[PDB]
Amino acid sequence: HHMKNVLSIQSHVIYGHAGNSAAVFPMQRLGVNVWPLNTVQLSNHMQYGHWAGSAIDAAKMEQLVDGIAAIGALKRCDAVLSGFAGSPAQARATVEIVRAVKAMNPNAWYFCDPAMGQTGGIRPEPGVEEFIVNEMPALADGMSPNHTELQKLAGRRIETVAEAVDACRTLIARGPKIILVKHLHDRNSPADRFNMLAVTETEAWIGQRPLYAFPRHPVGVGDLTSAIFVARRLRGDSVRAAFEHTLAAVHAVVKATYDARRYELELIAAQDEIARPSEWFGAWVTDV
Amino acid sequence: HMKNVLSIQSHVIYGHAGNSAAVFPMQRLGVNVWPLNTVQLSNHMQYGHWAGSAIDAAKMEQLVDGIAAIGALKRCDAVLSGFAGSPAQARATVEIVRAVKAMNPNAWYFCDPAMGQTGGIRPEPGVEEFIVNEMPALADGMSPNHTELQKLAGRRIETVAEAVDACRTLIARGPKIILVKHLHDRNSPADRFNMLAVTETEAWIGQRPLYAFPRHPVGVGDLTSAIFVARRLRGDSVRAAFEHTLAAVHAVVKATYDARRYELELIAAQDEIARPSEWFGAWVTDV
Ligand SMILES: [Cl-]
Ligand SMILES: [Cl-]
Numbered sequence: 001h002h003m004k005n006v007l008s009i010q011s012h013v014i015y016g017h018a019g020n021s022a023a024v025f026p027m028q029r030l031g032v033n034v035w036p037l038n039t040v041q042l043s044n045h046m047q048y049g050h051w052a053g054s055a056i057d058a059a060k061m062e063q064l065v066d067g068i069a070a071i072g073a074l075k076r077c078d079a080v081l082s083g084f085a086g087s088p089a090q091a092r093a094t095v096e097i098v099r100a101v102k103a104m105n106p107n108a109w110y111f112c113d114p115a116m117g118q119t120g121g122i123r124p125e126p127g128v129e130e131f132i133v134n135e136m137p138a139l140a141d142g143m144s145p146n147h148t149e150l151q152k153l154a155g156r157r158i159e160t161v162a163e164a165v166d167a168c169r170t171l172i173a174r175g176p177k178i179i180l181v182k183h184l185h186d187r188n189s190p191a192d193r194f195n196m197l198a199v200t201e202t203e204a205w206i207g208q209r210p211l212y213a214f215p216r217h218p219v220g221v222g223d224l225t226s227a228i229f230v231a232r233r234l235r236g237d238s239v240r241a242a243f244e245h246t247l248a249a250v251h252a253v254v255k256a257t258y259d260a261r262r263y264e265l266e267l268i269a270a271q272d273e274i275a276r277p278s279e280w281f282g283a284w285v286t287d288v
Numbered sequence: 289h290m291k292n293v294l295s296i297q298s299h300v301i302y303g304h305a306g307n308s309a310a311v312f313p314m315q316r317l318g319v320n321v322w323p324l325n326t327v328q329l330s331n332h333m334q335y336g337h338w339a340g341s342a343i344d345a346a347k348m349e350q351l352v353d354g355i356a357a358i359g360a361l362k363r364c365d366a367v368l369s370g371f372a373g374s375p376a377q378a379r380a381t382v383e384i385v386r387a388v389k390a391m392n393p394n395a396w397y398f399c400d401p402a403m404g405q406t407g408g409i410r411p412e413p414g415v416e417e418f419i420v421n422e423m424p425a426l427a428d429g430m431s432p433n434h435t436e437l438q439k440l441a442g443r444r445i446e447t448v449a450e451a452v453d454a455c456r457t458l459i460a461r462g463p464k465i466i467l468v469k470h471l472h473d474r475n476s477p478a479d480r481f482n483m484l485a486v487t488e489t490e491a492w493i494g495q496r497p498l499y500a501f502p503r504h505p506v507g508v509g510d511l512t513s514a515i516f517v518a519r520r521l522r523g524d525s526v527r528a529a530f531e532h533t534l535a536a537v538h539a540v541v542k543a544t545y546d547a548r549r550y551e552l553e554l555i556a557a558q559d560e561i562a563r564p565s566e567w568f569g570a571w572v573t574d575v
Contacts (some may be wrong), residue, residue, distance in 0.1 A: 003555065003556055007301075011347045012299075012323070012325065014294075014322050014323060014324050014351060014355060015322050015355045015360050016460065020325075024312075025315050026313065027507030028312050028555050029558070030560070031555065031556075031558075032555070033555050034301070035301050035302050036301060037301050037328075038299065038325065038328055038398070041324075041325055041343070041351065042354075043350075043351045043352070043353075043354025043355050043357075043358075044354055044355060044358050044360065048358045048359055050354070050358070051353075051354050052347075052350045052351050052353060053289070053351075054343050054347050054351070056328070060341050061328075063339045064301060064328065064330045064339050064340075065330070066330075067301075067329075067331055067338050067339035067340075068301060068302045068330050068331060069329025070330075070337055071302070071331050071335050071337070073302045073303075073331070095393070110538070160469060165478075173323070261430075264476075266290075268315050268318065268319070268320045269290055269318075271315070271318075
């Protein structure tokens with residue numbers, strides 16, 4: 001009955017839902033305490049084409065976390081969740097925060113959502129992408145790449161489920177115990193399916209939910225996906241159960257957004273379905 | 289018909305104060321919140337030490353300008369403000385309210401004076417003075433505690449009827465609704481926490497149990513104002529919004545007290561925020 005605590009190190013968007021504005025409320029609604037460290041405050045998502053923002057630097061990130069430690073709270077952190085990093089220095093600061101939390105609490109784990117934004121190519125771009133690919137797997141207990149991010153982490157083109165499982169297993173050999181492929185581009189899947197995968201050293205699960213066609217795809221679905229998975233794991237779910245709850249909860253939010261003809265996620269409207277999804281999509285076993 | 293509130297307050301990473309006490313309860317009550325964080329603190333200042341980052345008044349206006357630039361400001365149904373660290377920040381909040389009301393003339397501004405530890409009838413120069421002198425003409429609702437109400441009214445207030453009259457005099461200055469988020473009633477038993485809600489035509493007094501914490505939790509005032517704002521946005525009557533606020537705040541405070549914690553048990557008590565299991569019906573009062 002002990003409440004778990006997650007330190008969530010992500011961007012904050014005032015209007016709309018991305019980063020901590022997509023992650024904090026769902027985890028709280030799922031019964032987990034969230035300590036949101038906002039690395040930047042943006043007026044709105046960058047996909048609108050223009051925005052205003054204010055960021056903190058890496059030194060300030062460390063100072064803020066020092067404050068949480070000074071009152072004795074940081075050692076009670078049960079998990080760290082990271083997302084978008086605005087600069088290489090911020091990504092390095094995230095790693096140092098994770099190292100401190102894990103040394104204070106040997107049961108704490110780090111879940112890294114690469115959160116590379118709009119990008120492409122197998123090669124990691126210099127700076128943040130390079131740092132995510134080269135440095136983060138060594139400390140991460142779980143990672144939640146989308147397809148593009150998985151190709152960068154693995155250094156490979158990936159087109160099938162089996163190729164993706166193999167890429168996940170190679171990444172797991174670098175450190176992480178679980179890879180949640182939060183969106184998989186499966187050339188063998190029907191076009192109206194949204195595919196996800198959950199891979200550990202000994203398990204692999206495929207899941208599918210309906211793919212909704214948006215004029216512009218909502219930002220924040222990846223951040224929401226990682227957050228729900230983390231919260232369900234903290235609530236004690238097995239890998240399969242956390243995976244299935246994530247798939248079903250994200251479906252409910254995305255469907256609500258589509259039915260409302262909206263671009264920003266219908267996160268608050270769909271909150272009861274985040275906590276207790278009504279429609280379920282059982283996963284099935286796959287392998288290399 | 290989802291409503292949106294722009295909440296302009298401090299953010300605290302660990303624990304619950306400002307937006308870290310206001311945003312989640314309003315969301316849990318079915319209202320969308322756009323949080324504009326004026327500062328980011330590691331923890332609240334009552335611990336004695338803390339770290340913080342901050343934005344200035346110009347950046348606050350620039351951030352809202354960004355929302356306006358994508359055409360979203362017309363979707364703002366209310367603005368909620370609380371503690372202000374400087375007169376410049378309070379003036380930036382006023383400019384933001386003006387910008388919101390230009391895009392949505394139906395939007396309303398709810399000001400929690402949030403003066404903190406203070407005393408006396410005279411407002412202190414600077415922020416307190418601005419709240420007393422300039423805020424009522426701009427705010428559609430205000431949630432003073434007892435000390436703040438005395439400063440707003442320029443009067444000593446000791447009875448419920450005196451407090452209603454002070455609220456009515458303040459309402460004649462601009463606001464449509466006053467929530468006295470903690471009322472000092474010399475005729476009430478010491479173990480009662482009194483609140484009052486007043487409009488030009490209604491006045492409701494209510495009570496929940498007063499708990500004697502060894503160190504009183506921070507953020508109860510922020511939680512109270514936020515729940516009331518959310519219930520009003522959901523369309524509650526004055527009395528219903530008032531009673532839900534009293535019962536939901538009780539549930540959170542009781543949960544915190546029962547666990548002997550300092551930080552509010554906000555997430556643990558979330559179902560009681562939405563559906564309080566113990567109710568404290570209000571009663572009519574007047575001048
Ligand atoms: Cl912030
Ligand atoms: Cl109290």
